[PDB]
Design a protein around this ligand. Sequence first.
Ligand SMILES: *[C@@H]1O[C@H](CO)[C@@H](O)[C@H](O)[C@H]1NC(C)=O
Lengths: 51, 354, 370, 49
Amino acid sequence: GTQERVQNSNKKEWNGMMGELLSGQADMIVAPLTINNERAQYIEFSKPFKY
Amino acid sequence: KIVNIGAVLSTRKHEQMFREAVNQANKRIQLQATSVTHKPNAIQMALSVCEDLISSQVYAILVSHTPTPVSYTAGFYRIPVLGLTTRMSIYSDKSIHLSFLRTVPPYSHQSSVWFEMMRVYNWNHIILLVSDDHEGRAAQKRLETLLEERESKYDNKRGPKAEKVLQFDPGTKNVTALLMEARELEARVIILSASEDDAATVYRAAAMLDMTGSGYVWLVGEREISGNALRYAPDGIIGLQLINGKNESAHISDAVGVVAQAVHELLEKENITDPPRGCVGNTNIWKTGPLFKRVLMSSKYADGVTGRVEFNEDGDRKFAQYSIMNLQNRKLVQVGIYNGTHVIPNDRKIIWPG
Amino acid sequence: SIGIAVILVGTSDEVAIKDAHEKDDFHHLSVVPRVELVAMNETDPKSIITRICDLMSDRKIQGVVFADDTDQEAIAQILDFISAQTLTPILGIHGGSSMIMADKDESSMFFQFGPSIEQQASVMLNIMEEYDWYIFSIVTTYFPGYQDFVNKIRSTIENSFVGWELEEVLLLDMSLDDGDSKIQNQLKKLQSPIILLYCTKEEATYIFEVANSVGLTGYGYTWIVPSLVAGDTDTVPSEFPTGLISVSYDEWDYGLPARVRDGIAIITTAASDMLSEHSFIPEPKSSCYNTHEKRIYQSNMLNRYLINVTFEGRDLSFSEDGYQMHPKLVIILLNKERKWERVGKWKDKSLQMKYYVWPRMDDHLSIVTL
Amino acid sequence: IQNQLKKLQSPIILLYCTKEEATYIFEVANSVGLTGYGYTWIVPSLVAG
Ligand SMILES: *[C@@H]1O[C@H](CO)[C@@H](O)[C@H](O)[C@H]1NC(C)=O
């Protein structure tokens, strides 16, 4: 999941996995999913289930 | 110098009430009355009014049942207008009509019955629907304009939610898929404020797929609980209507009373030039047209038949009254609303859908 | 059958005579324009409809071009009303009948010249970007539009990887005469270099007269304003400070002849495409008001084929809502000569200024590298 | 004056004035609105006296 400014309109849109949730498609994300500062804005995360 | 006033359209059952009111003034500034009947193919109806009303140096205009370019025309020359019996909220603007000053609540502002029918039962989950037109688009804008409040300024208070809205055309075609996107959601409080012909089609298409059973809770607006709505709807709904509604004369008195109540406050400005007389051949502006329109924004007399006339910042009627309807098998019960601002109960049999 | 006219009404510019016949490539549009170029005197709404309908029923003009010279901000809507039940494409041109009119009916076909507030805001952002200072606070009044103004920023302050920011989006209220203790107190909470605005001249002079009493009009800040303060382009109410930037366009670019030539070209190019894509042309209706039997008739849909059309050249594409798709505007700095300059121009997302570095009205220096 | 001191930022401010002078300057401060919570003016006796 990243922020690709798709062509024909310079607008941000999440991609693939990290966007399959915010698009209302998914319900919950269990994965090796990382914790940056970017994603923490829109979606809320669990506690760290590893280090 | 006697001041004059004139009607617009089919108020044929009122031609004596205005005169009786005019007599009711100097015994409560010579005043009179005049009128005209509208005609189909409104194009000439626009022109057919000037050399008769803007000719006699009018000071106001009174319309009734789609008000004509009296919305537009009197704006030219800046002639303040106090119309009635018209609803569609497009006249909400201040830059499409220079002085449109309505005396009803316009079908948008009926928002706050909902937000005051939901924040008494502690509900917080909703959905919404509007159809592609300006009126509801305002109603959508209205509802999404209020729900920002009720936030935490009292010391960690919380409020309701505003779940995914929908949009659709006037809807000659099916609506299933749009609805199909809403079914699997986790709420039931549905609103739908488009129109009669829209409500009938949407109910006719919605009763096919059984999203219209129990648990659902509908809070519908005025023009969707009448007309063809009774020919295709299943009950349980919570409809809305006003306490005077489509009537004849409970209101011309209020009109002329608000008109006359300011004339004493006008005559002390030493700038009381009139609007010109004679529609044809005028290129200036009566420099107290918008002013005479604006000073009516403070007329405070409660002695109207439906008393307490007072216009909002938009100049439309404020502190109105409604009738919290309901549909049973075929009955239409009532409970009284707001006492003006609060909520009050009235003993009746409230059922919910199913 | 479709008549085409030009109707200049009451000004000092009766110049449209010797120039409307250099468009002789309209035989490729396979229609001859019945070019009646009446010119009426000063006209009133009674006379307005009088002349317009007399002509539409005698000169029988199935597409018109208007002009005027006055600050009458409602005339266009009257034609919109005419165009509705008469089904007449109409193009208000000169300042006046072409001013910004937001929401009209869905059935008519009346269009305009000039920028809608969307473009008149986006160019604001491009200005702020090109000179490398990034958006700061907005200030607004209750005048209609804001609920469509702040959205156009908050849908472009975001979809751009650049580093936008934001400040307190204020919202005033003026016409209360008891809350003068609640406006200065609302505008005493800004500490940003750039500050927008969106109001009308009456509230404009008032805010600036009270803003000057807050500490935001002199040196250091640069108020900017869209075209509504761009009205009578000769005023300097004493409470206005220098440096006030804006955006508009009135006459400095295109004169009336080519402008009315622009219009005739538009309408005739329209007459080309549909009547060349197909071979069906509108009908000569009987009257506009006193039909009394021809209020019930059929309607056509030419009003779709007037979106993607040019001058065999520059893009004169049109919307479905109605304003110039890619409009030609300018940018003006309020000089200390109490006049309005020309310090830019916009065309297809571009900016070219007579200045490289922005001047002042010396903590700023200019150093050389290799 | 009304715009001469609007670039002050430091959470402290000293001063040196007299009663009516002080009142004028404070009305100016309010008209700019830079004496809310956080700024803590400190004035000698000639205002106290
Ligand atoms: C409406 O009901 C409220 C409920 O507290 C009360 O103030 C009064 O009975 C009524 N009138 C007003 C103005 O609230």
